[PDB]
Amino acid sequence: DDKAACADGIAAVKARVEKLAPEAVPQKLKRALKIAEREQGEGEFDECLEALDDAKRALP
Amino acid sequence: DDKAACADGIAAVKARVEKLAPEAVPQKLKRALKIAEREQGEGEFDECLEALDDAKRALP
Ligand SMILES: [Ho+3]
């Protein structure tokens, strides 16, 4: 469901980001991940998924 | 728009709540107002309006 997809998506995006040089991680990518995590914590798993969409589009 | 409606709705619900004995304000009402304010601060003015709907239904 959205909750599992949100958690899986956060891990998937992080795993891809963690293969980047840290000094090269865009601020927009960090912010999108943080928004996703905030919304996950609020139980807005659907909004987490939309923030993950933004994070993926911010990947170099 | 949703932003103005959210701000107006927070004030409207508070004005009605502030006419209650404070020791008698339901916890569910306080929580709904706080959620609305959190979502307002996140710029989710639509989600604020849905939390305000819950607050109104929690009025004694
Ligand atoms: Ho939110």
Solving technique: X-ray
How many angstroms separate the alpha carbon of residue B44 from the centre of ligand 1? 6
Side chain identity at A37, as an amino acid letter? E
Provide the domain count of chain A. 1
Neighbours of A6 (CB within 10 A): 24
Neighbours of A44 (CB within 10 A): 20
Structure tokens, B37: 């304010």
How many angstroms separate the alpha carbon of residue B52 from the centre of ligand 1? 14
Structure tokens, B9: 């709705």
Q: What chain B residue is nearest to A42 in terms of C-alpha separation?
A: B35
Residues present in chain B in total: 60
Q: Compute the distance between CA of residue B47 and CA of residue B6 in angstroms, rounded to an integer.
A: 9
Which range marks the domain in which residue A26 is found?
2-57
User: Greatest CA span in chain A, whole angstroms?
Assistant: 34
Chain A residues whose CB is inside 8 A of the B38 CB are: 42
Q: Compute the distance between CA of residue A44 and CA of residue B49 in angstroms, rounded to an integer.
A: 15
Sign of the CA dihedral with A16 first, then A19, A20, and A26 last: positive
Number of A to B CB contacts under 8 A, please give it.
4
- Alpha carbon distances (Å) from A21 to A16, A17, A18, A60, B5: 11, 9, 8, 11, 44
Structure tokens, A49: 């998924």
Q: Compute the distance between CA of residue B60 and CA of residue B51 in angstroms, rounded to an integer.
A: 16
